[PDB]
Design an enzyme around this catalytic site. Structure first.
Site, PDB file in Angstrom:
ATOM      1  N   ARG A  57      -0.623  31.521  -9.925  1.00  0.00           N
ATOM      2  CA  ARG A  57       0.065  32.218 -11.012  1.00  0.00           C
ATOM      3  C   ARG A  57      -0.888  32.300 -12.169  1.00  0.00           C
ATOM      4  NH1 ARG A  57       2.934  28.027  -9.147  1.00  0.00           N
ATOM      5  NH2 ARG A  57       4.439  28.642  -7.520  1.00  0.00           N
ATOM      6  N   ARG A  76       0.235  37.741  -5.571  1.00  0.00           N
ATOM      7  CA  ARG A  76       0.942  36.712  -4.817  1.00  0.00           C
ATOM      8  C   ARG A  76       1.850  37.315  -3.758  1.00  0.00           C
ATOM      9  NH1 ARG A  76       1.785  31.228  -5.980  1.00  0.00           N
ATOM     10  NH2 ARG A  76       4.049  31.115  -5.678  1.00  0.00           N
ATOM     11  N   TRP A  83       3.529  26.814  -1.687  1.00  0.00           N
ATOM     12  CA  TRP A  83       4.945  26.733  -1.366  1.00  0.00           C
ATOM     13  C   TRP A  83       5.316  25.573  -0.419  1.00  0.00           C
ATOM     14  CZ3 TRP A  83       3.047  32.090  -0.739  1.00  0.00           C
ATOM     15  CH2 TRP A  83       3.442  32.931  -1.788  1.00  0.00           C
ATOM     16  N   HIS A  95       2.389  38.599 -10.924  1.00  0.00           N
ATOM     17  CA  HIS A  95       2.754  38.156  -9.597  1.00  0.00           C
ATOM     18  C   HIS A  95       2.377  39.094  -8.446  1.00  0.00           C
ATOM     19  CE1 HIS A  95       4.367  34.284 -10.063  1.00  0.00           C
ATOM     20  NE2 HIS A  95       5.008  34.345  -8.907  1.00  0.00           N
ATOM     21  N   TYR A 121       9.399  37.353   0.326  1.00  0.00           N
ATOM     22  CA  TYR A 121       8.422  38.360  -0.122  1.00  0.00           C
ATOM     23  C   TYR A 121       8.082  39.321   1.005  1.00  0.00           C
ATOM     24  CZ  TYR A 121       7.422  36.321  -4.696  1.00  0.00           C
ATOM     25  OH  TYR A 121       7.524  35.889  -5.990  1.00  0.00           O
TER      26      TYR A 121
END
Lengths: 322, 322, 322, 322
Positions: C154, C273, C296, C270, C305
DNA sequence: TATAACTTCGTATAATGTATGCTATACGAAGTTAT
DNA sequence: ATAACTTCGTATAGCATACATTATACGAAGTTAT
DNA sequence: TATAACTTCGTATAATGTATGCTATACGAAGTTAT
DNA sequence: ATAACTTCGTATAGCATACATTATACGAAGTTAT
């Protein structure tokens, strides 16, 4: 106290909420503790911590396993906690001494043993011999070993298999539906498939036993001297006899046990579980697939059977000479 | 107040509940806390969260690590919980400073450390530099570096080894039966094969040392300034010494220590573990194979040792290089 | 009440235990709720459930996102719970209405959006263009995109990278040590490796910026009109500017955003990512390796996602025509 | 008592917190419980654990499934928890009967069920039997069986489809945009490609039906006894009907129902889901690919559909067949 | 008959994992509407 | 009357969201070395 | 100077996971013992 | 005095066990159709 009587009465009313083995060991521990209290003039029910500490130390002093001592505490804890009373383990005297007894014993070698492994090579040898015999004893036993090693079910799971629990694949392999196991109680439960070999072994036994009369018969039943099966839909083959099949099959190949009294000098109920776990590891089966095999939802016990496959493993050694 | 006196007697009485290293840290923390209290006019026992909070902030101001601040807090929690008393951590004040102190300290980039890798590049260098030196301690140290690389064994573990724990296999490779377990649900004895080159070094050492002369004799022993070994079986070589072998070996090649006061400038007890694992993953070896080589079951740690290897750089690096 | 004042005072004293963004949003929600209470003559602190229900309904009626409404409740809940008071959510009026507001909005289309993906193809295109430019702006930006997509960090994680956080592999690849992330605060933290390409991009930027003067400089810093870097060891490049780099790089290729006001019309913090997650999935990377990539520890957000990679997937279709 | 009146008004007022199916089951359970109470002279509200225990034992005696007994208990827990009242399940009596009833019922081998697989063997049979029949309902049913197999879509989901949700791609393959989500953190609209053969069937149906004549018209509609379709956009075809298509299709081939009263003798709403997944894993397809095809994220379930496939028989079967 | 092959049982010791509460479908059955 | 529904109730299989934060998203205003 | 390229900030909205408590090592430093 | 320890204290990295059951292990005694 009125509440304690009530709580105890409630647990007894729905005793079927607990395994019968829990009850078996509740009473057994109570008998031992009751006895120790009587020998020392001590109130046995609401149990005093210090009394419990003396008792755990006495179990230790009889040379009992750390795990068996944890059992005696466990049931005392359960009897108190479900009564609404504080647990013995809720005091330091009991907590610290239990932790201490474990440390002393372990630090003098004590280790939890595991079942002698019954692995693929053992199964093929047993099979190479017994597959010929047309005896009923032999066909049944060979089929049970097959299932045990193929499916990794515990013996109590194997003795509960009903003939209607069995179905089939398009491929021709037998599937055995399990519902209840040690770690699980569901209605959907699990399916465990046999190879084509074990399926044959099992076909031979069904065929020769006449279990398939009533499809609510237990797949395994007893067999008498004369070789006649005794199917039942209300009495399963005791797990003690499945322990016996393992001991007889071991004896058949290796002869009689020592004089020593030690546990695990011959195959037992769990021998096929540690053995099939172990064989999978060594053939490179993935750790999840192993867990799926033995019904294991968590990783630690499986690591704890490849536990003693941890022998000469020697990765570093090869690295070193080149 | 009488309750806590009982609880502290419960503790002295069952003091063997914990290892003497735990008691050491407990005593050390109390000493630090009691000093801080005296010097700051605070009652030391029971501790009140306001005072514990100021104390942890003093520990942060002093430069102490976060794992260290946790330990002080831990033993304070322990000490109070093993009496009938409330723990500091169960207060909102101390709970929030621990949070505040943790993240605060990571933001100024305090970094968890680990053993400086003693690898194969380094064991060849060393061997090269003292392969054929005839000094009796140069011979001992060389052997021990062997065992530590090959077996990724902890240092207290190597202390305990004896000659009666040494059999053989193909070529000569020695069979080190161990107490790698000090746990119940865990292996009943493990095993480690030394290489042929390293088996050779733990041969030449046994010659000169003369440790064979008793089974119960520990493998590694003290060697005085006159190059003479001094076998024992009541007295194992301390861990601090085995540490010393590693630092000495570092000084040999790289000279006197870097003088920041810092940690992990030379090699230490774990350097061979770290180094061996890295070497093992470099040449490609199943991670869970590595895990078994030094008896890990908690990959968090081994991961940390092989992080900067190119074989571990991850999926994104792999994809990006097409 | 004395206790409520105390609890609040304690939280403020060690405010650094909470993210500054938590504080940012605590006050922001308080301002909005304070305002609504003032408009309706209502006691704003110990907040009445029914008042809170009216307020959530009013947020809904302004057309606010379900998730933003959950935010307003969240902070009210936290302010009360940490005060020692009951949470608004502890009553049915608030619980049921929150659940109802979600159901109505969702059942009218509302869906949580995700960042426009910045995937490999995007990165190669951006790179094919900007890799030539010897401008400072361009070299920095290209390097940041590289890191973003390579490491999946991030932006707040990227702005905290110090030059000393960087190390190297034998292989020549850069490693970036992270300590703090959203989901994690440790001293050991994590290492994220760059490919050889991205390493070059990053070398160019270091080289051209002069960040490596003081190794406590933030790897990324601002760059002015004249193309001069402005290294600092005490002021990081705002995450707002890293959001800007993503918006400028998008604009560079696709031109200007719509008139609509919608979020996610261009790349944002983001974007790399969701994009790198997504690319890994589609190249067959294992779900654990994906989780290791993005830090994660749990599986659900990653599924969430590849969420919208779920497009035409068409397994069944192929099955059908043959 | 006034509190619970408020709590029940909170509930009616925010009744849209729950779906009308939850309210249905809630109301149904209350009706069953209240009847049981009246007929057994028990106060129905608040419920007392002794009475709830007898009631659950009545539900077991009545032959009800364990998932069903849980539901009654659930709504009772719900109803009481949404008032200021203690839940039955928080009592020791009811907690133990649920345990007792669960395992009891698994021992007499009550088995969780599921949809009878509607597979490709079955969709060819059907197509064969009515490929070129010109009956307007035979045409509709055939189309819908197509969509249900191809898209593994739930039945309420297929109800909602409209013609405005249908674009195209290579060959003709229709583009069914969906509301497969009724969740916030979840896809913002999904997509399903029909095959070319099935796209053909959902063509021939659109011809005869005449649903195109309005965008907002639902795809599937009522077809009366005179073979005429009856398009609507205020009225979607009920799920019970779509169910009916499946049962009718079963009756077609296998004739009238087996008459045990049992469940899953014909096909039902889910049969195509189940069937498609099985077909998909038969020809080998990544399990998480299957998971995406019918929007699963909780593999417990899909597993249960493909259990008796030979490709899923496990590691032990694989090893045993050498 | 004596005996294989149990069952039952007691005490001893290993193993095993850390959940629901809402919402959809299944289906017989009663209600509705146009053929 | 009946096909072909819809609505319903009770029976079960199948699923997803709450909680406590900590983060990004972006427009708009103030800042500062060119 | 006007201006790029920020920072700061507010309100808006997505993301993210459900832990410690004991025991070993690190290491400077003081204590011990035989060379 | 010094090498070469051991013991110690304080600083940190590294790990494993408790809890509530439910199961198997096995010797020994009672059972039952041969």
């Amino acid at each position: 106290s009125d509440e304690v009587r009530k709580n105890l009465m409630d647990m007894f009313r729905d005793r079927q909420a607990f395994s019968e083995h829990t009850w078996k060991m509740l009473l057994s521990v109570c008998r031992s503790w009751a006895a120790w209290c009587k020998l020392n003039n001590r109130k046995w029910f609401p149990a005093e911590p210090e009394d419990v500490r003396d008792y755990l130390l006495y179990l230790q002093a009889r040379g009992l396993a750390v795990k068996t001592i944890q059992q005696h505490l466990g049931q005392l804890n359960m009897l108190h906690r479900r009564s609404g009373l504080p647990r013995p383990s809720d005091s330091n005297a009991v907590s610290l001494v239990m932790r201490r007894i474990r440390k002393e014993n372990v630090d003098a070698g004590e280790r939890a043993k595991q079942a002698l492994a019954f692995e693929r090579t053992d199964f093929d040898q047993v099979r190479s011999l017994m597959e010929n015999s047309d005896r009923c004893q032999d066909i049944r036993n060979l089929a049970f070993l097959g299932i045990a090693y193929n499916t990794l079910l515990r013996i109590a799971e194997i003795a509960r298999i009903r003939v209607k629990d069995i179905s089939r694949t398009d491929g021709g392999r037998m599937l055995i539906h399990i519902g209840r196991t040690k770690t699980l109680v569901s209605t959907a439960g699990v399916e465990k498939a046999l190879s084509l070999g074990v399926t044959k072994l099992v076909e031979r036994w069904i065929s020769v036993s006449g279990v398939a009369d009533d499809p609510n018969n237990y797949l395994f039943c007893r067999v008498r001297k004369n070789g006649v099966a005794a199917p039942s839909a209300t009495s399963q083959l005791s797990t003690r006899a499945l322990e016996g099949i393992f001991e007889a099959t071991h004896r058949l190949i290796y002869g009689a046990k020592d004089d020593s009294g030690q546990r695990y000098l011959a195959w037992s109920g769990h021998s096929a579980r540690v053995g099939a776990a172990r064989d999978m590891a060594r053939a490179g089966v993935s750790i999840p697939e192993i867990m799926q095999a033995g019904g294991w939802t968590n990783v630690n016990i499986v690591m704890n059977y490849i536990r003693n496959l941890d022998s000469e493993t020697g990765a570093m050694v090869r690295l070193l000479e080149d």
